[PDB]
Design an enzyme around this catalytic site. Structure first.
Site, PDB file in Angstrom:
ATOM      1  CB  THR A  96     -29.621   9.302 -37.227  1.00 44.26           C
ATOM      2  OG1 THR A  96     -31.010   9.334 -36.885  1.00 44.26           O
ATOM      3  CG2 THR A  96     -29.177  10.700 -37.606  1.00 44.26           C
ATOM      4  CB  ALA A 103     -36.774  13.626 -33.192  1.00 44.72           C
TER       5      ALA A 103
HETATM    6  C1  LIG Z   1     -31.280   9.120 -35.475  1.00 43.08           C
HETATM    7  O1  LIG Z   1     -30.390   9.309 -34.674  1.00 43.08           O
HETATM    8  C2  LIG Z   1     -32.653   8.668 -35.028  1.00 43.08           C
HETATM    9  C3  LIG Z   1     -33.749   9.509 -35.697  1.00 43.08           C
HETATM   10  O2  LIG Z   1     -35.040   8.946 -35.453  1.00 43.08           O
HETATM   11  C4  LIG Z   1     -33.908  10.922 -35.137  1.00 43.08           C
HETATM   12  C5  LIG Z   1     -35.225  11.456 -35.645  1.00 43.08           C
HETATM   13  C6  LIG Z   1     -35.238  12.502 -36.462  1.00 43.08           C
HETATM   14  C7  LIG Z   1     -34.404  13.719 -36.152  1.00 43.08           C
HETATM   15  C8  LIG Z   1     -33.294  13.338 -35.188  1.00 43.08           C
HETATM   16  C9  LIG Z   1     -32.820  11.929 -35.491  1.00 43.08           C
HETATM   17  N1  LIG Z   1     -32.826   8.758 -33.592  1.00 43.08           N
HETATM   18  C10 LIG Z   1     -33.223   7.621 -33.045  1.00 43.08           C
HETATM   19  O3  LIG Z   1     -33.443   7.449 -31.863  1.00 43.08           O
HETATM   20  C11 LIG Z   1     -33.360   6.540 -34.061  1.00 43.08           C
HETATM   21  C12 LIG Z   1     -32.479   5.377 -33.679  1.00 43.08           C
HETATM   22  C13 LIG Z   1     -31.133   5.720 -34.284  1.00 43.08           C
HETATM   23  O4  LIG Z   1     -31.411   6.613 -35.365  1.00 43.08           O
HETATM   24  C14 LIG Z   1     -32.731   7.159 -35.288  1.00 43.08           C
HETATM   25  C15 LIG Z   1     -33.445   6.760 -36.569  1.00 43.08           C
END
Ligand SMILES: *C(=O)[C@]1([C@@H](O)[C@@H]2C=CCCC2)NC(=O)[C@@H]2CCO[C@@]21C
Ligand SMILES: *C(=O)[C@]1([C@@H](O)[C@@H]2C=CCCC2)NC(=O)[C@@H]2CCO[C@@]21C
Ligand SMILES: *C(=O)[C@]1([C@@H](O)[C@@H]2C=CCCC2)NC(=O)[C@@H]2CCO[C@@]21C
Ligand SMILES: *C(=O)[C@]1([C@@H](O)[C@@H]2C=CCCC2)NC(=O)[C@@H]2CCO[C@@]21C
Lengths: 212, 204, 197, 221, 200, 216, 202, 202, 197
Positions: E1, E49
């Site tokens: 993210t 999320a």
């Molecule tokens: C980002 O931090 C991330 C996203 O999946 C998440 C989903 C959508 C809205 C909030 C952000 N959270 C996670 O656990 C994974 C791992 C690290 O980054 C993610 C893609």
């Protein structure tokens, strides 16, 4: 004592311009044994909405009952049936209410929006949801999803016409993708239940998958 | 998992008088990308190739020890090695370390040096050989590759259609795995030529 | 945590390291050298666990110089890097593993400049630029943004200054001064230290 | 994995399935779990695939050496002793579960060998994750001194029971019939499962894939 | 993210990626990490999320109630304080939230960082997520208060692009928002493949 | 309960044209010890419904108390409505799921059998709240040893007679006595038909030990 | 597992059950837990199947070699000593409870117990295994001095049947062996040959 | 601990050992494990001394109140039900194995077993405790229908003595009680009154 | 780790804190204020766990100002310190403990200047000088060496500069700028920040 167990199962949803398709496998298993060969994972909510649940079976049954009750309550309070988006938002709050002892359920909602177009909503076990055009869930989701990305989404394709998806092509694609999934995933097989949502209502079809 | 530390995906596919072997190009430490040109496919002959997936240190170690053994074999025997013999050699090398395993899984793709018959095989962590007439995959995105390969593969494909099939499979499979990707390289092995191609891929 | 960085140009390699030796919360030394001279045109930059760094680095140095004495010519950067990876990998599964992260910079008369990256698991990569430490996370994108393969050594020193300035702004550790060296066809040259008052 | 074996009036019937899995994904659909030991001795393997493979190969080589030395036909007890001593030496860290069937000068012999070095000499045996499903069929329908076709049908039924009721077993049924006068290695013997027909052609056409670089190397014949 | 936000002379710039991951499997490549609390107030989502979505929707409800009761729009500081107080009650229970609250109020532009640990800090430049370290370098080397609007857009796009290049858990598209005095606008959604073509 | 103490092994169930048959052995085991050798693990719920349980016998007895009281309470009203096998199955599922969600499970696996409105019912409930319906059922080790034989018969011939079903149950019980260590040679057979619920008491299986002489 | 040995004037009687278990599944239901170590020397094995088999094979090898070198029939005490040495040396690695019964011309019929840990004791009767716990009072109440071979066979069969009724790890058929100077006689009791005891009913 | 109850036509016989242990030390060597719950109803307690005492006192209180309100002699089944309710409700907290024996005018002499976990079963004879394991075969071999009070007393004493010989947690004296319509008779067997069984000697 | 320091003089109290807010390896903020104004002549300096610091500090601030509103006069520094210790100690054994380390500075018209030290276990000490953090270990001996009870505020600022310079030389963390305030009979005065380029 573990309060969870994995019971297998794959669900699939494809949205069209005037249709929705929700498909699932009918095998219920636990560990290396098969409980039953005739347990569908798709449930009718309204005349325009179908839900697909995979994961731990006790949670699936309880959640199905809770959702049906909430739909009846909404119709009593508001004098109308619930829309697909309203159902999705309600389910999101229902899932987050158990945040510290979750439902081990993966949910896909398929139906028609208020303009008559196809709508698919995908959820994670704690209530994060998104509107998609196609989605796979369950044990063979990682096998099914790339093929749908290629064949429905036309990803990685060069100079290919983006012809709109037809119900015939979608049905053939669903059948083929489940045939491929039953080859490599041990939790997937037996029979395939396909539900087609249109303005004329909901129509069901069953096809056979390999029993080993 | 110690296999997922560096990521990586390798795939081999069988045609009509041809073989194809494809791999991803990323080298990274967990979530960080370090390079985008890491070699995972090594030549073990003019029409014989081995692809290694797993821990990058073991990838390089196994490739170098395998070349040691293969060079000695070809000097002593005065012949070029057959693909099945190389499969047995690799299995022996991996099982010698049974209780201190190399964390790599190999795929072998080649043509027989005399009858020019396609051969593809896969080996797991400790050396159980799997010989197939269709396709073999290895890496962190194995389920995705399995779905794509089961849906797309057809018997008796000419080299061009084989290239299209394997390219589509690898691209769409690695697009769904986070620690695999950053480019794809494909080798098409025929009787009279080797064709190496680099694919236009997503770099995110 | 210690910081290493390397930038490769058309005819040169530029390396920088930090000069801090720390114990617990105090900086015991502020003019430490983390660069080892393998030959006339090879540099080894090593960080990691205490004791492991100097022992491994000096073993490699001794064997490279022994190659020079025995054969009358020097190892090429590629051969030195592969020797280093072989030794680290061999010791990985033994009872005395080395926890070292390394950069190897060199110039070959026939192959040109070379920069090699090695992690503690003994995986060897060839890179146009590379970095090691927690500060790498902060400065690798600056290199991605501004690096071109045809970069001159004046512009390379400017880009190095940008990266170190970012470390001074955003990094929680006190890394106030850096050692800077360059390797070209004429050998190893000590540049001025990059210091922040 | 489902492996089984029975003794009938004139010899041995061994049976196996052809599925190999890596976790819950199917890796191989045509694995051969019936291994050659000597022209009169065969082995069905379950457990860790590499361990089974290497152990059976080693014992087969040792028995070939013994038979060359003695000039006589090898005996099933010799294989049994070799296997169980080797497996006891490793304290159960070689994960091989074996069904050993042969015909020698003393008659038809069938053994079950466990990874810790325990051996049982029995008139019918099953091993694997689908062993209990096969054993139900054996305990329901086994009779002593069967004819070859009855024994083949029984072993086929037991392997089929393992296939349809266990998640780790599937695909085809392989058989091996060993008498003093003949050997029948039947791969495949029955095919209970097939793949359904494809209904769509996923546009495979040239120029769909975009290429950055290309290098062609000509090879000399 | 990767989420990013900075204040400059002409307002607030908010940028995010669109990749949702579950382990090493890419669940989605079109996820929305910016919540529209009200026409003058935006929030970003990093971490869990479901947590971020639920709690920022709850904040939106409370802010609407504030506007109804007090007949005036809420301030950025008050909204961030409300969110921090809401999430402090669940400390140690496993909430994963990293949020930026951005807006324009009677004090001008505002940008606040609120996390589930308890931090609530004001600032002019912020980046949250796995790729935030990679975005910080580009943003710090390019940031000025006197940027022009197109320059600010380009800087935000470049920083998110570099973060997706180096981080395995970032990717998809860059979604860009501009908070101005009359409200926020949706600037663009640019796929990082097209950005790779543009920047290489 | 968190640790079961006195347990029962496997319960079997088959539906046939005109009813359902359920079988269970009469043994309660305290670990490996065959401690209580004359206990009944089958219950008559009402004229249409019978129940069999495997697992903790104390939890089974608690359930028998609660279910019996519920049936009596319904019969006091005298309004012509009774509980169907399906309704008792649904109530059992709810009870088990509620106990699991409080982290205080009832350590039972239950088979419900019934005959109502000319239709046969056979249902499974597990400790966690997994519940389903099938034409044949087996719990515990019977899931591995008995379900294969029952399923094989049912795939070929989907409709059975009472005679065929009883014979099949006796064969499966013999197999369980051969291969289950926690098994006993005395069992009970409950049948539900249009006449109601009939329980046939201590029955034994005829065993064969000829292979003992083939060991040599 | 339930194993038993009783000494009578001029020989011994050994008896065992026939159950092999892997958890709650019966892998072998007709197993032979009585092993001929020599012509007039037998062992009853309890514990780990693999460990007991390996130890028995090694002792058979050593005892055969010893008997060939000495040109004499072996003593039962010698076999018990070999078992004791092996079980004490590898007591950390082995789970093996052994009963050694036999006849030799010098001391007659003899019964030795080698429990886990590797101690060796001579007994007039010995019982072992997991089911042996349930018949301790019965053998103490029923054992009398000066029993004949037939009385010993009946006594052993009764005890083994009582043990098999109450233990989930014991069952199957009863295997009996009588060893005297004239040799070895082996019997199997199955079905209705196994003694029956009435179950209490209300 | 070893506790036993046997039913005869017209009453019951209960018997127990007299050992309390805190590890390997005998804290009380003459304890009474037979408790009068009512005039013709007794319990044998096994397990935790404190838990069993508390449960017995609570059941005595409840049963006395019930009998006063109903103006009838209590039933043995009612006492067993009260014990079952308490032992099942607090099964996570209690270690209590109970035997309830008694006589009532409606059903005669009755024996109920409440094991750990809180199940309730009526038996013709019941045994419990840690030593009960060693006498399972003996009671199965020796029990016969239609025993008299004197035969039941002899049978119980024999079984308890056999259990006390083999168990380190059982011993002391034997306490016996016979309950019939005419009332309760209590006996102690000590020293040479305790049945003796000859020990095997070589 | 965060740094607090306080020096007491004959008629004044001098307090300084660092201005860094950090997350993992990055400095998110470099102008953070860690001083809370309880009244016109009382300052509270709080470090510790995130969220705990602001929640506890603002609860104390609200109750002190409520005392002023209700009674028409202000709490003395001693009374405010004892109120703070009571609340922290009461919450110590509950389910919601605060992990905060505090300094409290004040001026009373009748008692004079006061500096109070409190650790996370809620022990209250009165000190002539005090410090909190890992840097305390480095700067407490400098205060011991050069502090006299009769020190003027110019000399106090010089001694504070000595301590912060030592942090710049020997401390491994990057603490580049510090907030400085003084409390006297005229109230709270903001002095210039002490910055190191
Ligand atoms: C980002 O931090 C991330 C996203 O999946 C998440 C989903 C959508 C809205 C909030 C952000 N959270 C996670 O656990 C994974 C791992 C690290 O980054 C993610 C893609
Ligand atoms: C069977 O036991 C099985 C197979 O891999 C089998 C093993 C030995 C011979 C080769 C193939 N072993 C396994 O680990 C899986 C799990 C269940 O059965 C397997 C498919
Ligand atoms: C007996 O002790 C037992 C037997 O399997 C074993 C069989 C072969 C000869 C030696 C004894 N050992 C065991 O581990 C199981 C569990 C209890 O008893 C067994 C059946
Ligand atoms: C018996 O089970 C026992 C007795 O101490 C106890 C004594 C009073 C009446 C209830 C039973 N309980 C024990 O914990 C010890 C250990 C084994 O047996 C005991 C002696």
């Amino acid at each position: 004592f573990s309060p969870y167990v994995f019971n297998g199962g794959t669900i699939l949803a494809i949205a069209g311009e005037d249709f929705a398709i929700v498909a699932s496998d009918t095998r219920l298993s636990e560990g290396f044994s098969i409980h039953t060969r005739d347990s569908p994972k798709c449930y009718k909510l309204t005349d325009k909405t179908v839900i697909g649940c995979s994961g731990f079976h006790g949670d699936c049954l309880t959640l199905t009952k809770i959702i049906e009750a909430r739909l009846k309550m909404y119709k009593h309070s508001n004098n109308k049936a619930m829309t697909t988006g309203a159902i999705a938002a309600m389910l999101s709050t229902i899932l987050y209410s158990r945040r510290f002892f979750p439902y081990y359920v993966y949910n896909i909602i398929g139906g028609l929006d208020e303009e008559g177009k196809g709508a698919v909503y995908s959820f994670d076990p704690v209530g994060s949801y998104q509107r998609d055009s196609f989605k796979a869930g369950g044990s063979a989701s990682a096998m099914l999803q790339p093929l749908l990305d290629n064949q429905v989404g036309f990803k990685n394709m060069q100079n290919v016409e983006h012809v709109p998806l037809s119900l015939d092509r979608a049905m053939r694609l669903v059948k083929d993708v489940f045939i491929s999934a039953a080859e490599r995933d041990v939790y997937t097989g037996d029979a395939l239940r396909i539900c087609i949502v249109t303005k004329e209502g909901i129509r069901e079809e069953t096809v056979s998958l390999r029993k080993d | 998992s110690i296999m997922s530390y560096n990521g990586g995906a390798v795939m081999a596919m069988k045609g009509k008088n041809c073989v194809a072997i494809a791999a991803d190009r990323r080298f990274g430490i967990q979530a960080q990308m370090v390079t985008t040109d890491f070699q995972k496919i090594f030549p073990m002959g003019d029409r014989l190739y081995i692809g290694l997936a797993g821990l990058a240190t073991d990838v390089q170690t196994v490739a170098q020890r395998l070349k040691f053994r293969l060079n000695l074999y070809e000097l002593k025997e005065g012949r070029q090695i057959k693909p099945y013999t190389l499969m047995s050699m690799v299995a022996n090398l991996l099982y010698e370390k049974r209780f201190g395993p190399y964390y790599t899984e190999p795929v072998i793709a080649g043509l027989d040096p005399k009858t020019f018959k396609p051969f593809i095989c896969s080996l797991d962590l400790i050396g159980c050989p799997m010989v197939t007439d269709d396709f073999v995959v290895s890496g962190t995105c194995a389920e995705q590759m399995y779905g794509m390969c089961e849906s797309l593969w057809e018997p008796n494909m000419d080299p061009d259609h084989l290239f299209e099939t394997i390219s589509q499979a690898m691209l769409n499979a690695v697009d769904r795995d986070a620690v695999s990707g950053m480019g794809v390289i494909v080798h098409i092995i025929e009787k009279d030529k080797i064709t190496t191609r680099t694919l236009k891929a997503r770099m995110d | 945590m210690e910081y290493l960085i390397g930038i490769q140009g058309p005819d040169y390699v530029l390396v920088a390291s930090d000069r801090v030796a720390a114990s617990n919360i105090v900086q015991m030394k502020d003019d430490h050298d983390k660069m080892f001279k393998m030959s006339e045109k090879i540099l080894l930059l090593c960080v990691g666990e205490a004791g492991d760094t100097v022992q491994f680095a000096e073993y490699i140095q001794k064997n490279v110089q022994l190659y020079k004495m025995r054969n009358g010519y020097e190892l090429s950067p590629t051969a030195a890097a592969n020797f280093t990876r072989r030794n680290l990998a061999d010791c990985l599964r033994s009872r005395t593993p080395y926890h070292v992260n390394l950069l190897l910079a060199g110039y070959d008369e026939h192959e040109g400049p070379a920069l090699y990256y090695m992690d503690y698991l003994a995986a060897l990569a060839k890179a146009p630029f590379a970095a090691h430490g927690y500060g790498a996370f902060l400065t690798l994108s600056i290199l991605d943004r501004y690096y071109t393969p045809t970069i001159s050594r004046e512009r390379a020193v400017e880009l190095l200054r940008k990266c170190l300035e970012e470390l001074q702004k955003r990094f929680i550790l006190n890394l106030p001064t850096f050692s800077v060296r360059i390797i070209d066809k004429n050998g190893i040259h000590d540049l001025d230290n990059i210091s922040f008052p | 994995t489902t492996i089984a074996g029975v003794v009938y009036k004139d010899g041995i019937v061994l049976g196996a399935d052809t599925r190999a899995t890596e976790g819950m994904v199917v890796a191989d659909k045509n694995c051969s779990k019936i291994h050659f030991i000597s022209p009169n001795i065969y082995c069905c393997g379950a457990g860790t695939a590499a361990d089974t493979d290497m152990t059976t190969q080693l014992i087969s080589s040792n028995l070939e050496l013994h038979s060359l030395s003695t000039g006589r036909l090898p005996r099933v007890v010799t294989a049994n002793r070799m296997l169980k001593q080797m497996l006891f030496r490793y304290q159960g860290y070689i994960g091989a579960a074996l069904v050993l069937g042969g015909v020698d000068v003393t008659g038809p012999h069938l053994y079950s060998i466990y990874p810790h070095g325990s051996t049982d000499k029995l008139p019918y045996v099953t091993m694997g994750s689908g062993s209990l499903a096969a054993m139900a069929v054996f305990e329901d329908k086994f009779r002593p001194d069967m004819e070859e076709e009855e024994a083949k049908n029984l072993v086929s039924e037991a392997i089929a029971a393992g296939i349809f009721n266990d998640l780790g077993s599937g695909s085809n049924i392989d058989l091996c019939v060993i008498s003093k006068n003949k050997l029948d290695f039947l791969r495949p013997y029955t095919v209970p499962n097939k793949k359904g027909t494809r209904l769509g052609r996923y546009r495979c056409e040239k120029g769909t894939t975009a290429v950055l670089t290309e290098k062609i190397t000509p090879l000399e014949i | 993210t990767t989420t990013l936000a900075f204040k400059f002379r002409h307002g607030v710039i908010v940028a995010a990626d669109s990749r949702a991951t579950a382990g090493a499997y890419i669940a989605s490549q079109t996820v929305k990490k910016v919540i529209e609390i009200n026409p003058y107030l935006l929030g970003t989502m990093a971490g869990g999320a479901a947590d971020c979505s639920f709690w920022e929707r709850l904040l939106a409800r409370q802010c609407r109630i504030y506007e109804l009761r007090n007949k005036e729009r809420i301030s950025v500081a008050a909204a961030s304080k409300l969110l921090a107080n809401m999430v402090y009650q669940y400390k140690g229970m496993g909430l994963s939230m990293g949020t930026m609250i951005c807006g324009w109020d009677k004090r001008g532009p505002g940008l606040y960082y609120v996390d589930s640990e308890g931090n609530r800090i004001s600032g002019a430049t912020f980046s949250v997520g796995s790729g935030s370290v990679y975005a910080y370098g580009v943003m710090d080397r390019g940031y000025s208060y006197d940027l022009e609007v197109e320059q600010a857009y380009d800087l935000a796009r470049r920083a998110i692009y570099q973060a997706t290049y180096r981080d395995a858990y970032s990717g998809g598209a860059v979604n860009l928002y501009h908070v101005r005095e009359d409200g926020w606008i949706r600037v663009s959604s640019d796929n990082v493949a097209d950005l790779h073509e543009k920047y290489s | 309960t968190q640790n079961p103490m006195v347990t029962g092994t496997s319960v079997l169930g088959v539906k046939f044209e005109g009813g359902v048959v359920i079988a269970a052995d009469m043994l309660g085991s305290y670990g490996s010890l065959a401690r209580f050798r004359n206990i009944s693990r089958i219950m008559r719920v009402n004229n249409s419904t019978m129940l069999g349980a495997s697992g903790d016998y104390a939890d089974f007895q608690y359930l028998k108390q609660v279910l019996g009281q519920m049936v009596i309470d319904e019969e006091l009203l005298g309004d012509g409505h009774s509980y169907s096998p399906r309704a008792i199955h649904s109530w059992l599922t709810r009870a088990m799921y509620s106990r699991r969600s409080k982290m205080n499970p009832l350590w039972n696996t239950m088979v419900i059998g019934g005959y109502a409105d000319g239709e046969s019912f056979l249902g499974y409930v597990d400790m966690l709240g997994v519940a389903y319906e099938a034409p044949s059922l087996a719990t515990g080790y019977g899931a591995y040893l008995a379900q294969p034989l029952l399923r094989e018969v049912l795939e070929k011939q989907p409709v059975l007679s009472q005679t065929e079903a009883r014979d099949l149950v006796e064969r499966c019980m013999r197999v369980l006595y051969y291969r289950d260590a926690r098994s006993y040679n005395r069992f009970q057979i409950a049948t539900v038909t249009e006449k109601g619920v009939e329980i046939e008491g201590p029955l034994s299986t005829e065993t064969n030990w000829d292979i003992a002489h083939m060991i040599s | 597992t339930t194993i038993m040995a009783v000494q009578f004037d001029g020989g011994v009687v050994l008896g065992a059950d026939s159950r092999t278990t892997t958890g709650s599944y019966i892998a072998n239901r007709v197993t032979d837990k009585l092993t001929p170590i020599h012509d007039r020397i037998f062992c009853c094995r309890s514990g780990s199947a693999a460990d007991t088999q390996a130890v028995a094979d090694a002792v058979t090898y050593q005892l055969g070699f010893h008997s060939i070198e000495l040109n004499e029939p072996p003593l039962v005490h010698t076999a018990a000593s070999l078992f004791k040495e092996m079980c004490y040396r590898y007591r950390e690695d082995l789970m093996a409870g052994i009963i050694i019964a036999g006849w030799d011309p010098q001391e007659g019929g003899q019964v030795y117990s080698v429990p886990m840990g590797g101690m060796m004791v001579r007994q007039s009767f010995a019982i072992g295994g997991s089911g042996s716990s349930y018949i301790y009072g019965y053998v103490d109440a029923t054992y009398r001095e000066g029993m004949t071979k037939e009385e010993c066979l009946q006594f052993t069969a009764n005890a083994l049947a009582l043990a098999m009724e109450r233990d989930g790890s014991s069952g199957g058929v009863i295997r009996l062996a009588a060893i005297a100077e004239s040799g070895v006689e082996r019997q199997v009791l199955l079905g209705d040959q196994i003694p029956k005891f009435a179950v209490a009913t209300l």
